């Protein structure tokens, strides 16, 4: 939308006003503390001198302009019939020219989709709401496919033909983001971070059990996965929130109030995690609350049904496959029904793919936090850091570590160093530790590493310094 590149605006038929497009105007038009012109220059400079040429960059700009253009058709309902017909056959012409498609064919495919029954083909009637959902699904799908194609092209430019063995993975995903107006996207992010925390806890339990088998003694051999699986079952398992939303999307006459009513009828009191919303600090409104790993989070219901439906039209996809553009590359391949497609299902399958990819590699966890909301390192807000630490589970992780016997020291080093606690190999170490007035239940004897309860070593060493 910046005006410093008139060629894109000219070829994309853009009026330079963000308020003229419903896909963009419903949010924030512009903000300060940013100059998108410099970012555009950086991005198109990167695109120019790279593996690929500039004609496909122009094609991508055309595709994003068409995506902007889809938020303009009217689709007035026909008289005495539930069928929907278009009114503004101008933006449709622009979109067809941008994709190289036929405007009449695109309008006919949108208004009258065709489905193959048995061995023949039949048409389906669709009112304004169904075609609106279909065009929104088409726009979001083409955007995602364009992004995936760009990522694949960058990757194909990147690699070199040296043999590859046992790669090293680096991942960065946002954490337990919590606002005052939590919604469906926040729920998805929280679910992803919940799965990541479950994976971390399972890895820590595996390491602890490996240490126990190395020492031959198991202490509290209960897996920590069940301590956290309750929220995942509330979210992912059948009869959960996602499944109820998915089945409500397909119900004939379903609204958000009905969704909340069914959630309460299915989970209020049946599961400990689910609970009624709370009214604190004068928050706008809440509908239901969950006790996540970081604490109590309250969500909002309004808008979930509209943003979860993903009805992907098939005749429009077939039209896309016949364009004179990159649409063939984007839509090269396209069994659950087209209508029975939801954002939640795709998110769940992508999360499962990510988890099954990550399970094969040994993880390494790095936690990053922001100390100050502003850019001044001098001052750092205590509540913000407390909330971020609670979300990241560093305190939870250290408490899990200290729940068992984290204090382990070598026997010979203990014998030759800590004997000064009360100044005057296994048997000698045992005699030395039993001669220092130490309760037998607090420690556990082994062969190489001795298990000590938290705090015993600190008290032993702090009194040793006094006796020096």
């Amino acid at each position: 939308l910046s005006n410093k590149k008139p060629e894109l605006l000219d070829m994309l038929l853009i009026t330079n006003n963000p308020y003229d497009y419903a896909f963009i105007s419903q949010g924030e038009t512009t903000v300060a503390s940013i100059d998108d012109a410099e970012e555009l220059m950086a991005t198109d400079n990167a695109f120019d001198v790279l593996g690929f040429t500039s004609e496909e960059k122009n094609s991508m700009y055309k595709l994003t302009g068409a995506i902007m253009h889809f938020g303009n058709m009217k689709f007035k309902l026909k008289q005495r019939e539930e069928q929907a017909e278009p009114d503004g056959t101008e933006e449709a012409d622009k979109s067809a020219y941008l994709m190289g498609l036929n405007s009449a064919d695109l309008l006919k495919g949108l208004c009258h989709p065709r489905v193959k029954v048995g061995n023949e083909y039949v048409t389906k009637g669709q009112n304004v709401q169904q075609v609106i959902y279909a065009t929104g699904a088409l726009a979001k799908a083409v955007y995602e496919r364009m992004f995936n194609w760009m990522v694949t092209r960058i990757n194909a430019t990147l690699e070199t033909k040296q043999p590859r063995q046992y790669f090293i993975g680096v991942l960065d995903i946002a954490g337990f983001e919590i606002f005052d107006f939590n919604s469906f996207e926040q729920l998805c992010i929280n679910f992803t971070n919940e799965k990541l925390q479950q994976f971390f806890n399972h890895h820590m339990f595996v390491l602890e059990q490996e240490e126990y088998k190395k020492e031959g003694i198991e202490w509290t051999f209960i897996d920590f996965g069940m301590d956290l699986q309750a929220c995942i079952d509330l979210i992912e398992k059948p009869m959960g929130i996602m499944s109820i939303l998915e089945e409500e999307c397909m119900f004939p006459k379903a609204t958000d109030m009905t969704f909340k009513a069914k959630l309460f009828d299915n989970h209020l009191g049946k599961s400990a995690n689910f609970q009624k919303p709370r009214n604190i600090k004068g928050k706008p409104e809440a509908h239901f609350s969950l006790i996540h790993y970081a604490g109590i989070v309250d969500y909002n219901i309004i808008g979930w049904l509209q943003k979860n439906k993903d009805p992907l039209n098939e005749t429009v996809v077939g039209l896309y496959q016949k364009s004179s553009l990159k649409l063939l590359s984007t839509l090269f391949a396209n069994k659950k029904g087209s209508s029975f497609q939801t954002v939640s299902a795709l998110h769940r399958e992508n999360l499962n793919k990510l988890m099954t990819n990550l399970r094969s590699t040994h993880p390494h966890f790095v936690r990053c936090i922001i100390p100050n909301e502003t850019k001044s390192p001098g001052v750092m807000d205590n509540p913000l850091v407390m909330h971020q630490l609670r979300c990241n589970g560093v305190l939870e992780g250290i408490r899990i570590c200290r729940k068992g016997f984290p204090n382990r020291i070598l026997y010979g080093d203990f014998r030759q160093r800590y004997r000064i606690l009360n100044p005057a190999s296994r048997k000698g170490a045992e005699k030395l530790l039993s001669s220092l007035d130490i309760d037998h239940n607090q420690y556990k004897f082994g062969h190489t590493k001795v298990f000590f309860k938290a705090g015993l070593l600190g008290l032993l060493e702090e009194m040793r310094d006094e006796r020096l």
Binding site: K116, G118, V122, E247, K336
Partner: protein, 371 residues
């Protein structure tokens, strides 16, 4: 668990997995046997041709419909049809696929009992369920109220639903359907010189009915128009030649649905049965039923049936109320779409009749709390 959905219907069998918007296999419910002797030795013809192959061999076989009006009358043909559907068409193993079966209202309970017995003991399905055609049709239309008219090939029935609550005392069933229309088409074509007697010519007359028949908005005026002008005459291609010209018989055949006295029936037309069924309901829900008249079934696909029925109902209904008839393009496959939608719901998972429950409760499990 990719539950299976089937729709035996009448005259057409359509089946496919749940979660889809289109049946994967549609073929007539016809079983045929050879009637001649056969002289060629070594080819080894099979003793029965079932499904679509019987239409290919239509000229040498004797086609038989295992169901007359909803009720199965020849069961062995029904195991044959179900085996064909499960193996030759879908290529699935029914040992791990729950099956949803669709059944018409107001039928003998022995029919449902035998369906469940066949499903559980012959094919060994882990679970199954039997549902009503009209409720599934109303699922597929995205509605929650409105009287729905389901006219297929075996039986025509109207079921009024309001806010998801059925009105069983107002459910009406009429046995007039497509097969009677085909028989009347033969009986009315025999007066022009065209005689169709064999069961193979049943299919030709049915094709003529499907391709060249329409419902007229008016009858007397249309008869006067056809009796003078020749603009209503069309020609048809028989599978060997000798084109035939059909005149006023193209709109006289579907008039049986509105004038059932043509075939000697005593009842009234569908336009009157629907109005009576609406009037049997409560006075506080007649508005939504009037404004949400839903059509389904293959027989309701005649060009111009919706306009004629709307005109007749408006003539019957009070003049101060709007009348709206919903006729989507996919009336024929609406019931299967509704069945797939219902089977895809997660709240339906606890309404299956499991194998253990069936073994515990006997064949009479169908009519218990589990429907």
């Amino acid at each position: 668990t990719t539950a299976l959905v089937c729709d035996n219907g009448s005259g057409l069998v359509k089946a496919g997995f749940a979660g889809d918007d289109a049946p994967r296999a549609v073929f007539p419910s016809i079983v045929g046997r050879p009637r001649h002797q056969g002289v060629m030795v070594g080819m080894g013809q099979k003793d029965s041709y079932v499904g679509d192959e019987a239409q290919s061999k239509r000229g040498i076989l004797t086609l038989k419909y295992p169901i007359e009006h909803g009720i199965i009358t020849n069961w062995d043909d029904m195991e044959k049809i179900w085996h064909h559907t499960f193996y030759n068409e879908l290529r699935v193993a029914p040992e791990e696929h729950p099956t949803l079966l669709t059944e018409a209202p107001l039928n003998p309970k022995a029919n449902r009992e035998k369906m469940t017995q066949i499903m559980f003991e012959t094919f060994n399905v882990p679970a199954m369920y039997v549902a009503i055609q009209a409720v599934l049709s109303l699922y597929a239309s995205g509605r929650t109220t409105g009287i729905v008219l389901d006219s297929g090939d075996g039986v025509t029935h109207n079921v009024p639903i309001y806010e998801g609550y059925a009105l069983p005392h107002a459910i009406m069933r009429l046995d007039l359907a497509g097969r009677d229309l085909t028989d009347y088409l033969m009986k009315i074509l025999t007066e022009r010189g065209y005689s169709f007697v064999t069961t193979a010519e049943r299919e030709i007359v049915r094709d003529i009915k499907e391709k060249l028949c329409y419902v007229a908005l008016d009858f007397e005026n249309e008869m006067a128009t056809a009796a003078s002008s020749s603009s209503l005459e069309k020609s048809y291609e028989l599978p060997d030649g000798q084109v035939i010209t059909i005149g006023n018989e193209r709109f006289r055949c579907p008039e049986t649905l509105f004038q059932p006295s043509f075939i000697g029936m005593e009842s009234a037309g569908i336009h009157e049965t629907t109005y009576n069924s609406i009037m049997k309901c409560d006075i506080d829900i007649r508005k939504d039923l009037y404004a949400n008249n839903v059509l389904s079934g293959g027989t309701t696909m005649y060009p111009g049936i919706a306009d004629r029925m709307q005109k007749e109902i408006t003539a019957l209904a009070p003049s101060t109320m709007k009348i709206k008839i919903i006729a989507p393009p996919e009336r024929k496959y609406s019931v299967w779409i509704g069945g797939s939608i219902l089977a895809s719901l997660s709240t339906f998972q606890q309404m299956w009749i499991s194998k253990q429950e069936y073994d515990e409760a006997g064949p009479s499990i169908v009519h218990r709390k589990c429907f």
